[PDB]
Design a protein around this ligand. Sequence first.
Ligand SMILES: Nc1ncnc2c1ncn2[C@@H]1O[C@H](COP(=O)(O)OP(=O)(O)OP(=O)(O)O)[C@@H](O)[C@H]1O
Ligand SMILES: Nc1ncnc2c1ncn2[C@@H]1O[C@H](COP(=O)(O)OP(=O)(O)OP(=O)(O)O)[C@@H](O)[C@H]1O
Ligand SMILES: [Mg+2]
Ligand SMILES: [Mg+2]
Lengths: 56, 401, 285, 372
Amino acid sequence: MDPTISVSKGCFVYKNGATRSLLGKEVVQQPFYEEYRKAWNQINDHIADLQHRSYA
Amino acid sequence: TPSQKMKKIRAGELSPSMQQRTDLPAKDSSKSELQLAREQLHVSVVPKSLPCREREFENIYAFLEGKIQDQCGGCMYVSGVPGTGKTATVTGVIRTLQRMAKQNELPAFEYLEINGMRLTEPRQAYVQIYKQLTGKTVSWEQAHALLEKRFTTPAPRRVTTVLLVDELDILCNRRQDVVYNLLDWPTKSAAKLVVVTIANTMDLPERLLMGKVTSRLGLTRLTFQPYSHKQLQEIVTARLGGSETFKGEAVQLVARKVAAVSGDARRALDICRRATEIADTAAVKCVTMLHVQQALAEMIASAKVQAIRNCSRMEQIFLQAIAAEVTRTGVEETTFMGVYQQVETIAAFMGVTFPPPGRALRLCSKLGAERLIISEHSRNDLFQKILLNVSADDIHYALRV
Amino acid sequence: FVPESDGYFHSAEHEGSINAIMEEYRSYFPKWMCILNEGFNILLYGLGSKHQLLQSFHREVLHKQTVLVVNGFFPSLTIKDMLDSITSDILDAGISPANPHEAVDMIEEEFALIPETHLFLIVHNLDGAMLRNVKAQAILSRLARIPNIHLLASIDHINTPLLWDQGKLCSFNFSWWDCTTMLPYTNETAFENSALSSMRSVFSSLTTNSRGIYMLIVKYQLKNKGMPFRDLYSSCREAFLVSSDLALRAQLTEFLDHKLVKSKREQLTIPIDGALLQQFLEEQE
Amino acid sequence: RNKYQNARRVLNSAETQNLPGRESQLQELREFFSNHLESQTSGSLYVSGQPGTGKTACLSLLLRDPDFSKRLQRVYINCTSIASVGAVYKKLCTELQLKVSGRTERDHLEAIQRHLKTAKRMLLLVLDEIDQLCTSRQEVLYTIFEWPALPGSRILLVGIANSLDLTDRALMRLNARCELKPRLMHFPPYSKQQIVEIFKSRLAEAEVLDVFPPVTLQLLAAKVSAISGDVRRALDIGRRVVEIAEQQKRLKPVQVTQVAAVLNKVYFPLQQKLMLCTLVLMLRNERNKDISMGRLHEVYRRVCAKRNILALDQAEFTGTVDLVETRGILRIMRKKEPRLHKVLLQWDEEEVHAALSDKQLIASILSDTACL
DNA sequence: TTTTTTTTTTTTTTTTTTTTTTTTTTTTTTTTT
DNA sequence: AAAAAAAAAAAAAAAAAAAAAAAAAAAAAAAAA
Ligand SMILES: Nc1ncnc2c1ncn2[C@@H]1O[C@H](COP(=O)(O)OP(=O)(O)OP(=O)(O)O)[C@@H](O)[C@H]1O
Ligand SMILES: Nc1ncnc2c1ncn2[C@@H]1O[C@H](COP(=O)(O)OP(=O)(O)OP(=O)(O)O)[C@@H](O)[C@H]1O
Ligand SMILES: [Mg+2]
Ligand SMILES: [Mg+2]
């Protein structure tokens, strides 16, 4: 059938350079990603500051 | 450094000797006749020619002489209740064959012996067999690999090796790989291995051995039956020899009372020694039948009447109450609360007062430590379960009469 | 979905359709990469088998990434295998400790030291036969919280969020996707967790004495329409079929080895109806 | 020296070169190996049979056959001589002279998997007594039986075992795929005529055919094929016949009376008598087979009170019951306390009455119902 | 620069703890009256 | 609806597997000369 339908194992490692920012550059340099990153970081920092001022 | 000592111990370079006496031992001229009979009646002094085991000697000697002369190897299984001269007969056959091999009447052979009860694991059997060929102490994996290379690979001139396995049922486990390896190595042609296995249970190969292991164990069996009273009398009379320290009826009384219980030879040889030590105190040179009856009363003991006779007053009242509660409710396992109610009844009948329940638990713990009763931990008071370990007629004999 | 409670109290064109369905689901893959980039996890909950869809996602998209594919439908899977796999094969840190939460602590402390090193893991049937306890879901939700480790998973059972509380469901920052293919469950249901001919094939390998013993058992069972041990031992001893009683116990243990007669408490009941036993008794004549 | 010793030598119960009872099975295995050598395809095989049927003999004969010595490389592994279930990979590397980084079982497994993909020669891997590789999850046996499904592998493996349904009980998941299903092969137990031909071959191997007339061979072979059917018992009884005839007579052929006495061989203290009589009485006069040691001893004390015999105490009675259990008559269920051990009789009452041979005593015990 | 000593890390071996199998006993379900 | 068997499940003992610790062995660093 498949390479991963082995009767012995359950887990399959496809390690490619693992040792002891997922998207490409063509999506990040688009302006909507930068605008979404700025807006989400602004809203998250404001919510964190409100929670700090509540808990202090 | 002691690491050199352990390096030479694991390699077998220094012998494990023992400390010696600062005094020289006694001579046989300074001993009495009763001391000489006590020394000959020791179970450790095995004779050269065993009485009553001549047919078993012929059977084992025919098997081992055939397996040595045919240069093939095989397996035998002897069995019987303890004290019936199994290991003594097998090692006597081995000593006779080694005497015949030292005088060029037989092909030579190497005799290894292991005991299943001198090992902590069955895998350590491999450590002992390899310790009897070379003398080195290694791990069991390396020892098993070296034994496998020795017994599978043919190499002239290989000599016949007779392997004795005492207490085979201690080598049997869930997987049965040590016993399968010891019974599979004779089946190969390149190994001149003769495995003689000694055990107690007669139905051992069909009870707890797998089908391949009892398939390789074979059908050549030998059963060492227990000794009758004539045979125990002949054993003890041959131990005493030309002395007259024992009577002719004292040996018969020991034989009749030992052959009816177990058929053991160690029991007769220890009861005769105890009779000798009793007769040594009474300043008589012979062992009469009264010393034998005293030794048979002491060695075949029954001291649960004297224990109940030597208990205190409240403990004997408690022992009456457990039996009365067993009679009343019918069942054998009684809780502490009904036993304490019967305690109050019996103590009000006798007119004496009893301790509170906290000290009645101490009486119950004292009787349970001595195993006159079987009791639980006292953490669950008034609901702990009590069995009467002694019989109910024993209390009514110990307290009435 | 609204289940009505009263029932508890009173108690071709298909292939082209599936091809269009799979092309529609293969359209969602750059959106899945954009969603997995922002910290969410992917959960699929359709009817059919989502094995091939996740495998094609691993081939077509995550071809160069560190991907641990876990088959949750595997009946001999354990959390020790997955944690040993992450600590040993990806991180080169040997065997994970026997405490699994300590192993997840070790994995978080080791993935904190390597940013821009993302471990993807694709779990077919997250509700699998060895992941339906609460501890394995706690370990998987603790793994999914790490910003380096990303998760895709399949859901097939109907009672799956009964073991996800709100802490596990906030650790599992899921993005739920309705990937309803219509593929049958061939790879998921094939494993170990999901006759008179067998009796005749076992009876072919018997010897003569075992044949007579089972003949006596079936003849008594069909005469009296289980049987005791004593009358069976007397019947084997009168026909000289056995030497002792322990050989009968060995032959009956050999019969119970092959599921031919059933022992009870010794009662010996053959667990096949009387009519097929009558046909088998007439078969030897 | 003489001919009884020569028969005792040549029967031998050990490895032989000629296998007269296994002539269709060896040809079937030869057809298997030839069809997988000429087509150059891999395959699993599972041989199973009763202990003593000739499976190891067939595969050890085919592993010395020179016609398969050039085309394929033969590796034999006995699975009882391996230190662990996960250690077999290392032994296989030891059997294949592989170069491993080592010191973990996964490295030996990856060395085997790298060897099986680019091997210059087809491998024949025989695993004898494969039931020792069965465990809880059985990762090792499922890894071994999957090497036919490896990409480009040419390994063909034989697994030898005793149970007919090992691959149907402990290897069920391999039935999920038709490729990974091992081909079954059962070795049937030997009939009467096959054991007669084995005996005649072994006796003609050293020209000692005059010692055995045909009628004792037919009687012994009919008895062995009736009871068990394996050739180890056949050679053991055929050797015990000549080793009782040699010790008895010391040329006279072995008659039917001596093999009859050998086949009837193959196929008492007083307190132990009073123990067994009391257990027979308590099993007769009560439907409850739950008999403890204290409950048996309390009836035994009354029994020896009625015979005017000084009975043992509990401490010697327990040893008496254990010494009767060594004969196989009883079975003792052990508990926390020795009073609560459960004695279970495992013989018929006719067998106990025959083994005692003391009818005037046991007839008096069973008439003494009042002491129960 | 070469040799010998003492530290450090790896690998093997033994011990202890946890898990798994196996036997026994109970216990809730099912059939008969 | 109760009495009695019966199969399923729990308790417990016993054996094995795995983890942990301790010792042996090999590699590395630092002193001896
Ligand atoms: N026939 C005999 N003649 C003289 N002494 C005997 C005889 N039989 C046994 N003994 C003595 O009794 C002891 C029995 O020891 P032995 O080792 O032979 O018993 P065993 O059957 O091997 O016991 P176990 O089965 O417990 O090992 C021996 O030390 C021996 O001195
Ligand atoms: N057909 C035969 N002809 C002659 N001898 C045979 C034959 N078959 C088996 N034997 C003898 O039986 C022994 C081999 O039996 P084998 O080891 O093959 O049985 P097995 O099924 O492997 O037993 P187990 O299952 O217990 O391992 C050898 O001693 C051989 O001499
Ligand atoms: Mg002994
Ligand atoms: Mg074999």
